[PDB]
Structures are given as structure tokens and as C-alpha cells.
Amino acid sequence: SITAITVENLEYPAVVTSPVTGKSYFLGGAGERGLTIEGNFIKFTAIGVYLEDIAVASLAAKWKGKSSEELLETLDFYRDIISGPFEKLIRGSKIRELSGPEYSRKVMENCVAHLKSVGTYGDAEAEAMQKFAEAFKPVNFPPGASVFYRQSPDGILGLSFSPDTSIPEKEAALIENKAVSSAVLETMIGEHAVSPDLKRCLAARLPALLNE
Ligand SMILES: O=C1C[C@@H](c2ccc(O)cc2)Oc2cc(O)ccc21
């Protein structure tokens, strides 16, 4: 009984299947990001986080039988989702048009702050973030356009870009670095991520699946 979610008219199917891996994922949660200007929240993108179907078996052990309220306050729960032994797929869709460099600037900012924060930001990670940036330079995201982050548990982050919301057939780049590979999702549902809309969805939707 996993539902779909719509954010500012951008729909996120309950399940999807990757053309690059052949795996299927279920929608863990959706939300929105933007900027607060003069006390006003200005929407720019929508975000949906998908978890590989096998994530349920992996998470069942420690989190089955926990209440949504209980999960929402347990940081360890989100750590297992971020670093769990399964693929995660994040789809960011634009509400307002942003060029590749415009969108990526803030994302890289947050990723770099996190990496430096946990003491894992050396030359390799800096070079990986440079490659990350490079991948976005030739892209533009008009309303409805999407970016796909495929977090592989093998320490690789795959980047895809779509003119709309459909999953690209091929990936535009592969960032091969363990620390950086989870940085993006970290800044969305990790401990130091202020917006809690995504964390709440995860806390609310997982319990049902973890039981069956
Ligand atoms: O989905 C987004 C939007 C993006 C953004 C919004 C407005 C803007 O002007 C530039 C970038 O910031 C982010 C930063 C992150 O760590 C993770 C996700 C996002």
C-alpha cells in the first residue's frame, strides 16, 4: 500500500525501475527545497528519494515494529537509510528554472560542508566534487526538468539529467568516491539537514513495509 506523492504538480510514482541498473525502487518520501528570502520561502525544486526494494529486508532487523514517531527521532534510523547496503535513487525536479551551475553550487556547498564536518574531505573528495560540478556545467533545468542521483552502495554516485521527469537511459557521469557518494543524500535526510519533510515521509511510510 505504498502510494505516490505529488509536489507542486510534480508527481513521484510509487515505484520505478532503472534502465541503467535494472533494479526497482519504492518511493521513500518526497518534499521541496528552495530559498528563504526576507522570511519568505521561495520554492525552486522538488525532491523524491527512492529506496531499492531490498532495503526493506535490510532495515527490517533493527527498525521493524518501531512507530513513525519513534523513527523520526532516531538518528541511527536515518544513518541506516543513508549508508545502508542497497541503492538509493534521488530525483530532483525543478519548479523554477535553474541552470546546471546555479543548481549545483548550493548542493556542492552543502556536500563540502558535510565532508569537512566529518573529517573526510581530502584531495580525492575535492577532485570528485570538481568532477561533480563539471557534469552540471553543460545542463539547464527548465521547470519539470530533473536530475537523478543514483547512490550505489559500492561507493559510486551516478548522475543523470532529464528534460522532464522520466529516467534517462544512460548516465551522464560516475563520481567514484565513497565519502562523496553519500554526501548528497546526507544533506537531505542526514542529521544536519534542517528541512524535515523528507525525514517525516520516511518515518511515516516505512513502518507499514517493515512489518510485511
Ligand atoms: O533540491 C535542492 C535545491 C538546491 C537549490 C535551491 C535554490 C538555488 O538557488 C540553488 C540550489 O539546493 C539543494 C541543496 C542540497 O544539499 C540538496 C538538494 C537541493
Q: What gap in Å lies between CA 58 and CA 29, rounded to an integer? A: 18
Domain at 203, CATH number:
1.10.890.20
The answer on whether 6 is annotated among ligand-binding residues is no
Q: What gap in Å lies between CA 207 and CA 209, rounded to an integer? A: 6
Active site residue 94: yes
Q: Are residues 88 and 100 in the same domain?
A: yes
Measured from CB, residues less than 6 Å from any atom of ligand 1 are 33-35, 44-45, 47, 92, 98, 102-103, 106-107, 110, 187-188
Catalytic residue among 12, 25, 103, 121: 103
Catalytic residue among 33, 91, 150, 199: 33
At 66, list the grid cell.
518501531
From 7, 12, 32, 33, mutation site for ligand 1 pocket: most ligand atoms within 8 A of C-beta: 33
Helices 100-117, 123-136: inter-axial angle, 10-degree rounding: 160
Among the listed residues 154, 206, 8, the one whose alpha carbon sits nearest the alpha carbon of residue 92: 8
Catalytic residue among 91, 94, 199, 205: 94
Q: Are residues 78 and 98 in the same domain?
A: no
CA triplet 35, 36, 37: central angle to 5 degrees?
A: 105
At residue 27, what is the residue type? Answer: L
The answer on whether 140 is annotated among ligand-binding residues is no
Q: Are residues 204 and 177 in the same domain?
A: no
Q: Do 20 and 170 form a contact (C-beta atoms < 8 A)?
A: yes
Among the listed residues 123, 167, 124, the one whose alpha carbon sits nearest the alpha carbon of residue 145: 167
Q: Do 157 and 171 form a contact (C-beta atoms < 8 A)?
A: no
Q: Are residues 67 and 146 in the same domain?
A: no
Active site residue 199: no
**Count of domains for the chain:** 2
At residue 83, what is the residue type? Answer: S
Contacts of 203 (CB under 8 A, 6+ apart): 68, 69, 71, 72, 77
Q: Are residues 173 and 160 in the same domain?
A: yes
Q: Are residues 112 and 64 in the same domain?
A: no
Q: What is the DSSP string of 158-205?
A: EEEEESSSSPPSS-SEEEE-HHHHHHHHHHHHSTT----HHHHHHHHH
Contacts of 142 (CB under 8 A, 6+ apart): 94, 97, 163
3-state secondary structure of 148: strand
Q: Are residues 76 and 14 in the same domain?
A: no
**C-beta neighbour count of 171 within 10 angstroms:** 19
* Final resolution, Å: 2.3
Q: Are residues 49 and 122 in the same domain?
A: yes
The owner of cell 580525492 is 124
At 50, list the grid cell.
527512492
Among the listed residues 96, 68, 37, 39, the one whose alpha carbon sits nearest the alpha carbon of residue 196: 68
Q: Supply the range of the domain harboring residue 74.
A: 55-83+189-212
Chain breaks in the chain (C to N over 2.5 A) after: none
Q: What gap in Å lies between CA 150 and CA 141, rounded to an integer? A: 18
Domain at 122, CATH number:
3.50.70.10
Q: What gap in Å lies between CA 143 and CA 56, rounded to an integer? A: 33
Q: Do 153 and 52 form a contact (C-beta atoms < 8 A)?
A: no
Q: What is the DSSP string of 35-78?
A: EEETTEEEEEEEEEEEEETTHHHHHHHHHTT--HHHHHT-HHHH
Q: How many residues can be counted in the chain? A: 212
Sign for the pseudo-dihedral over CA of 117, 119, 125, 127:
positive
Q: Are residues 50 and 61 in the same domain?
A: no
Q: Are residues 201 and 113 in the same domain?
A: no
Question: Strand runs (DSSP E) across 68-162, as ranges?
Answer: 88-94, 98-99, 140-141, 146-152, 156-162
Contacts of 72 (CB under 8 A, 6+ apart): 196, 199, 200, 203
**53 to each of 105, 131, 183, how far by Cα in Å?**
32, 30, 22
Q: What gap in Å lies between CA 12 and CA 21, rounded to an integer? A: 19
Q: Are residues 145 and 211 in the same domain?
A: no
